[PDB]
Design a protein around this ligand. Structure first.
Ligand code: PR
Ligand code: PR
Length: 547
């Protein structure tokens, strides 16, 4: 008979992740107080939990109409709206949660992250300060990955990661410890949700193919937390490795499965570092666990032993800000899919571009396009009459917001051209119309910069003071294109303006990229497989391995 006892239990069971118990419990609440916004909100949260997002959004909107002053309801509504594809409506929901409970950092940091994704820069500096103060206060309430978008030092990034990671570790009893095998093929595991048409699969696919034919004494095992999406990438990854389907298993079941296969070296390619539900790692299923590639910064985590970088992106100066022990490959830390044919795209006119203007390109995630990166790009357009800025179309009204900013910055908004979303092969052919790629700060282009360079387009960047701000720089360095890493925004603008107004010099720079992309080691994955493989053998030899 206890209505509130029912729901609270509802939430309890859902917290566990327990399915039908939580719902059963909700069903009993609504029978006692029909329409009640708490029960109703809760039934929406069940649905969202059952991943029925549209039904989830319907229920929560109802609840939210019946209790519009309630901050938790407003938050949960934002969660469902987001997962239902309703981006702008998601934003209004978070905005209202935040207004109602500004005291709550978790909500503040959700709002901020979603605002950046929409290019909505209202209260940007204020929300950003609050999030940075929450890190300093040691709560663990901001997500490490979302934190990479802020311009904060390597030291703050470490504080954010380790406070989050230690929150997890405190509530996980690891598995009993094991050790690297002494004899037999080395088993090297990689855990990811991006084994498919996602950056992780895309970057590593040709590497795994090279390791297969070149490193006999090593077995690559992929543990895929997502199902087969039908992409060529997922299929090439499964033929090049032993690919285990661990999708929809709990964290304990997954850890037990990795331990059952005797994984010696386990790589976190999940993309979340110490955040995003890394309890498979906190359980320590593998004797040696390594952070590489998918998250560009430190895990801060007591369960992570090594991080894999390179001399440019992770120089000696930056080492103390990593909780992991630092290992370095001999060239760039980042592989790429050097099997890819670049098609001829349709004409410039067919892609929405002037045929006769300089096209500056910044294909990047929307949350990377902040006021600083945009202002410096628009400063190039003001100095160079016939140039245009080519961007990826963003979620919500992000493009409309960028047009307004361009207008407010003295630039005709029709000079921004937005590419819609295309399958990878079609997206990649577009680079053939790009004259210069303009990198962002402080979170660089990662896959989009190696896509640009593979197609022969030069990348301009200002290497900064965190790993995530040095990724594009590292590519240039290892390619041999050091003059395209410049000091600061003012040199960024002068180099771009000089290049954009000297088409003969820019032509000569495209010629240089062409030669360097063949003569450097950046796009030889056989060489990358030899280095990576040798480094794997030494890490293991070092913990007991004997071949
Ligand atoms: Pr052509
Ligand atoms: Pr051209």
């Amino acid at each position: 008979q206890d209505f509130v006892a029912w729901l609270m239990l509802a939430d309890a069971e859902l917290g566990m992740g327990d399915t039908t118990a939580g719902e059963m419990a909700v069903q009993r609440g609504l029978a006692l107080h029909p329409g009640h916004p708490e029960a109703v909100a809760r039934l929406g949260r069940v649905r969202w939990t059952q991943q029925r997002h549209a039904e989830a959004a319907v229920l929560l909107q109802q609840a939210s109409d019946a209790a519009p002053e309630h901050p938790g309801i407003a938050l949960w509504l934002g969660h469902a709206l987001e997962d239902a594809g309703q981006a702008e409506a998601a934003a209004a929901a978070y905005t209202r949660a935040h207004q109602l409970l500004p005291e709550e950092p978790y909500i503040t940091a959700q709002l901020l992250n979603w605002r950046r994704r929409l290019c909505d820069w209202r209260a940007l500096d204020v929300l950003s300060a609050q999030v940075r103060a929450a890190v300093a206060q040691g709560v663990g309430a901001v997500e490490p990955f979302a934190f990479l978008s802020e311009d904060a030092s390597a030291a703050e990034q470490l504080a954010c990661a380790r406070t989050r990671a230690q929150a997890i570790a405190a509530s996980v009893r690891p598995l009993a410890p094991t050790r690297v095998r002494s004899k037999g093929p080395l088993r090297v595991g990689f855990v990811s949700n991006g084994f498919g048409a996602h950056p992780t699969g895309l970057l590593t696919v040709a590497l795994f193919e090279a390791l297969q034919r070149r490193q006999p004494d090593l077995q690559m095992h992929l543990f895929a937390t997502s199902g087969d999406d039908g992409s060529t990438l997922r299929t090439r990854l499964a033929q090049a490795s032993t690919l285990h389907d661990v999708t929809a298993l709990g964290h304990l079941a997954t850890a037990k499965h990795i331990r059952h296969h005797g994984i010696d070296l386990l790589f976190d390619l999940r993309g979340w570092g110490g955040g995003g539900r890394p309890e498979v790692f906190a359980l320590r299923p593998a004797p040696v666990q390594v952070n590489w590639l998918a998250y560009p910064g430190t895990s801060g985590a007591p369960w992570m032993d090594y991080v894999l970088g390179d001399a440019f992106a992770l120089p000696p100066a930056l080492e103390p800000f990593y909780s992991e022990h630092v290992l370095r490959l001999q060239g760039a830390f980042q592989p790429s899919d050097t099997s890819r044919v670049v098609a001829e795209p349709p004409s410039r006119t067919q892609c929405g571009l002037p045929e006769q203007g300089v096209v500056l390109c910044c294909f990047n995630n929307s949350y990377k396009l902040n006021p600083q990166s945009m202002a410096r790009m628009l400063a190039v357009l003001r100095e160079v009459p016939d140039s245009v800025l080519w961007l990826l179309s963003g979620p919500g009204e992000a493009d409309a917001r960028l047009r307004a900013f361009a207008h407010a910055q003295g630039v005709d908004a029709q000079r921004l051209v937005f590419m819609p979303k295309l399958p990878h092969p079609q997206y990649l052919a577009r680079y053939r119309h790009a004259d210069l790629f303009l990198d962002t700060h402080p979170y660089n282009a990662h896959t989009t910069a190696s896509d640009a360079l593979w197609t022969g387009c030069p990348v301009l960047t200002t290497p900064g003071e965190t790993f995530a701000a040095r990724v594009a720089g590292s590519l240039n360095h290892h390619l041999g294109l050091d003059e395209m890493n410049v000091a600061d925004d003012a040199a960024f603008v002068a180099k771009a303006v000089a290049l954009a107004s000297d088409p003969a010099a820019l032509t000569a720079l495209h010629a240089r990229v062409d030669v360097l992309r063949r003569a450097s080691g950046v796009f030889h994955m056989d060489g990358f497989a030899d280095d990576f493989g040798a480094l794997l053998q030494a890490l293991a030899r070092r913990h007991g391995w004997l071949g």
